[PDB]
């Protein structure tokens, strides 16, 4: 029931937490704590739109999340996913105000259509998030660009 | 541009059975093709519902048989079997052979939870305007060509659209072309006997859903 | 398992003549920086490692707030932190 604290000092990445920190740990200023983005494409995670989707899937009852971050990197892979109901209105919510597509794309799979939408949100199968510019959400948003990830906080040195 | 057609390859020596099909209880719809999404507007007779009824009528007029002496007249005695003996199948234009004339070929679909990614909309847009092809490049690769093994032009089996808008066509068109055997009475009597027989068939064919005429 | 050691970042860090103001700045798409850690596979790694270890957690406390959007997870760390060796 805790949130994982990355300590690093030169490139000692100790997964710590303040429930370890030790008394000769540096914590001077708030500036030396962020949060960061990390991409899950590669090998084994296929990146056409039908077996993408098999990574995603929809559900209703469950209220979308969305937490900052505050640095990612450049994703090979990304979407970007309109879809209509079989009755024509929106499948996908639109993008919440101040929320804009990944910032660093190499290549963004655009696609547009219909489908059944047997849900109220799309979510990920395998409990990842969806990262937009510096928000990662829980769901995904009609017409904007996102990689999948992951979110991890660092203890950085003075 | 239509009887350029009959006269260029049919007439005189092939005479045509017509039907214009169409659909007074269907609504009009609106369909997105993947992945470009933009809204496809489609008449009333290319319902998928209308489609399987059209396709229903049209088999049983290719099992029509007439009797002739002691013969039962088929509708591939005497029709243009341009592949035969090869491939023996009748020309039949109509837009129901961009499937094949067939309904498993028409129910097509390729899709998951998110999208539809290939169905006999797409399948439809893309044949109308490459009639020749072997492969749609959808997910589903199916071909156009019917099953005489030609090509089914689209502006000879669809009527009421605008432009090249295939889609928004209000009509069906459904061509047999068959023998004139002007060359030849027994084959003539033959020929003349089925046709008896598919004229009283499609004047009464009872299907509320569709309105079929002729010329 | 499943790792890239090339870590190529982004990040937001124009503070000279008029760019500091929002009218002739850059626009969103300009505010970042960019650059490429490198031979550092046992971080970068255990970095990759951590953001996949810390999604249940983050999954759990997301589920059980009720804002919309989180931005205060690394202040309630630093505040830990000092009730931890001062409260
Ligand atoms: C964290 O890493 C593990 C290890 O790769 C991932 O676990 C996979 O989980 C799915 C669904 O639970 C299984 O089908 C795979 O077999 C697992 N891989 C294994 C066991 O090697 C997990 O998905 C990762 N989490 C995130 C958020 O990326």
Known sequence: ?158 | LEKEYFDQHFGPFFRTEQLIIRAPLTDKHIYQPYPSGADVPFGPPLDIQILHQVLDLQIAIENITASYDNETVTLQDICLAPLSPYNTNCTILSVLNYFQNSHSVLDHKKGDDFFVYADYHTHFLYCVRAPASLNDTSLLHDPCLGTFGGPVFPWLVLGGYDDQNYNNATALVITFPVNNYYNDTEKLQRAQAWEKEFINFVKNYKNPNLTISFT | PKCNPNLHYWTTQAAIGLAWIPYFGPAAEGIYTEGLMHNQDGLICGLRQLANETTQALQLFLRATTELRTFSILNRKAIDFLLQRWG
């Open chain 1, 1 to 158: 029931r805790s949130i994982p604290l990355g300590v690093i000092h030169n490139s000692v990445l100790q997964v710590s937490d303040v429930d370890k920190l030790v008394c000769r740990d540096k914590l001077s200023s708030t500036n030396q704590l962020r949060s960061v983005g990390l991409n899950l494409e590669g090998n084994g995670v296929a990146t056409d739109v039908p077996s993408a989707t098999k990574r995603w899937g929809f559900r209703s009852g469950v209220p979308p999340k969305v937490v900052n971050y505050e640095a990612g990197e450049w994703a090979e892979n990304c979407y970007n996913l309109e879809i209509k109901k079989p009755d024509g209105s929106e499948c996908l919510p639109a993008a919440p105000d101040g929320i804009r597509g990944f910032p660093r794309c190499r290549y963004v799979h655009k696609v547009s259509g219909t489908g059944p939408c047997a849900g109220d949100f799309a979510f990920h199968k395998e409990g990842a998030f969806f990262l937009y510019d510096r928000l990662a959400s829980t769901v995904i948003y009609r017409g904007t660009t996102f990689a999948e990830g992951v979110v991890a906080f660092l203890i950085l040195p003075q």
